[PDB]
């Protein structure tokens, strides 16, 4: 089965903006694993921003929550990462993650989108 995670949607953008990220995986994935959104900022480690299905409830890190909000779409094996009320702290790299506790040992990452929150 093919496993592939595409990623889109970053960019620059205003504080108080919106940005969109969207992850793309081949049904095999998007189906039965649970999907996760971490960020890296420069000069720190990746960190958790939301997860959605896998039979676990929606989660998502206290920085973000209220603001950030994930979701899914069948039609086109996508989850999307609605992120308003974006600030400074929230400039990183986003990746999307895939993975599975019970039977694979393995996770698998996106390439990374980068999301630039600059006051200009």
């Known amino acids: 089965a093919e496993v592939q995670l595409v990623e889109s949607g970053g960019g620059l953008v205003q504080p108080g903006g919106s940005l969109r990220l969207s992850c793309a995986a081949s049904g095999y994935i998007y189906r039965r694993y649970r999907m996760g959104w971490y960020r890296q900022a420069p000069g720190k480690g990746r960190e958790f921003v939301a997860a959605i299905s896998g039979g676990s409830s929606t989660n998502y890190a206290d920085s973000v929550k209220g603001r950030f909000t994930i979701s899914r779409d069948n039609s086109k094996n996508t989850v999307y990462l609605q992120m308003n009320s974006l600030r400074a702290e929230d400039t990183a790299v986003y990746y999307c993650?895939?993975?599975?506790?019970?039977?694979?040992?393995?996770?698998?990452w996106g390439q990374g989108t980068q999301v630039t929150v600059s006051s200009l």
């Open positions: 993650a895939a993975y599975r506790i019970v039977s694979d040992p393995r996770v698998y």
